[PDB]
DNA sequence: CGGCAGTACTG
DNA sequence: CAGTAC
DNA sequence: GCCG
């Protein structure tokens, strides 16, 4: 819808991986807005008018009209090329990728050879390329089909759904975010040792990055995964393992986008409720630096849309959560 | 002035 | 806990 | 960065 984005996209990402991450929050905003409206912007006006566009995102809106080029792009730290390399790694953020550039490394191959990795990081590594791909959702379908054959092979009561991306009917998908559960709201307990151990039979998990299997209370798998066959690359995996009482704000926190996640979690806090992937509370108590003190009630969501409803909002249909 | 979402692993 | 990621 |  506009192309002033595209250069306040590059600002966000420098701010991002150095580490500024309000000051990238905040032209994150001002671009989803941006990307929202369908007159480009022509006066201050018409810009300061738009949530998320101040004063200052106001005159840079207008220098890349008035002059068709951002100057402060030009002073952007030559730092930042590296600082996103480093970043692009699984399990490596701003504070390792500032700590190895001021240890002076400058690629991956000084990774590689001089930098001490964490288990995840050195995962990340291996499969740096991949991890940055997205796949078609076709294949995403596949990944899916073989978690949730798995799951029912031995219980066909088990729910699977791929979330993320997916339903928000994406073409192409980052990952696969699959969520299980189960309508009898108790059969999902103790289910991921069967689960990965089933995905790891058949060869189909070729690494994790997080998974606390030693804990009953596993709630999350976090890895890799290939399907069979030749031209295949490897794939990041999801899993989330949800009790039935919680799979409407499960569902709804997994479908997100993460950006529309933030923000009606952000109104539910105006509302002195409190939204998360566990449930939608209300009475909620906190203190001044927004806090919370309080635990408040659990209101009964057993739907997405009363998610929406208790909040007091039209629902919207996943794809129309892709911000 | 100061919050900007709420939460789950890892070591 | 800080860091990281969903 | 923006906004209450
Ligand atoms: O910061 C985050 C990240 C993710 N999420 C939720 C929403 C998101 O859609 C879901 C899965 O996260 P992914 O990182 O898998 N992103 P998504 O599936 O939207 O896109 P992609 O295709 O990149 O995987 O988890 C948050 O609430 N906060
Ligand atoms: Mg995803
Ligand atoms: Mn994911
Ligand atoms: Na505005
Ligand atoms: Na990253
Ligand atoms: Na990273
Ligand atoms: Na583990």
């Given at each position: 819808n506009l192309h002033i984005t595209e250069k306040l996209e590059v600002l966000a990402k420098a701010y991002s991986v150095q580490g500024d991450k309000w000051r990238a929050l905040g032209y994150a905003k001002a671009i989803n807005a941006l990307k929202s409206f369908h007159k480009p912007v022509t006066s201050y006006q018409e810009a300061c008018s738009?949530?998320?566009?101040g004063k200052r995102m106001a005159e840079k809106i207008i220098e890349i009209l008035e002059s068709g080029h951002l100057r402060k792009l030009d002073h952007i730290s030559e730092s930042v090329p590296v600082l996103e390399l480093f970043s692009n790694?699984?399990?490596?953020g701003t504070k390792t990728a500032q700590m190895w550039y001021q240890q002076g490394f400058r690629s991956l191959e000084d990774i590689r050879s001089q930098a001490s990795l964490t288990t995840q990081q050195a995962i990340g590594l291996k499969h740096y390329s991949d991890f940055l791909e997205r796949m078609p959702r076709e294949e995403a379908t596949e990944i899916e089909q073989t978690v949730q054959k798995a799951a029912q092979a031995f219980n066909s009561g088990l729910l699977c759904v791929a979330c993320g991306s997916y339903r928000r009917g994406k073409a192409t998908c980052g990952d696969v975010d699959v969520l299980i559960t189960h309508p009898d709201g108790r059969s999902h307990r103790g289910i991921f040792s069967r689960l990965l151990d089933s995905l790891r039979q058949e060869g189909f998990l070729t690494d994790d990055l997080v998974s606390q299997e030693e804990n009953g209370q596993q709630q999350k798998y976090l890895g890799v995964c290939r399907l069979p066959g030749p031209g295949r690359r490897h794939r990041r995996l999801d899993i989330i393992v949800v009790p039935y009482s919680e799979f409407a704000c499960a569902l709804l926190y997994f479908t997100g986008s993460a950006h529309f996640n933030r923000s009606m979690r952000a109104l539910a806090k105006t509302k002195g409720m409190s939204l998360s992937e566990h449930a939608l509370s209300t009475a909620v108590v906190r203190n001044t630096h927004g806090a919370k003190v309080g635990p408040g009630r659990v209101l009964p969501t057993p739907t997405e849309k009363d998610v929406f409803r208790l909040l007091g909002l039209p629902y919207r249909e996943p794809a129309e959560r892709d911000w």
């Open positions: 738009i949530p998320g566009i790694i699984w399990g490596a």
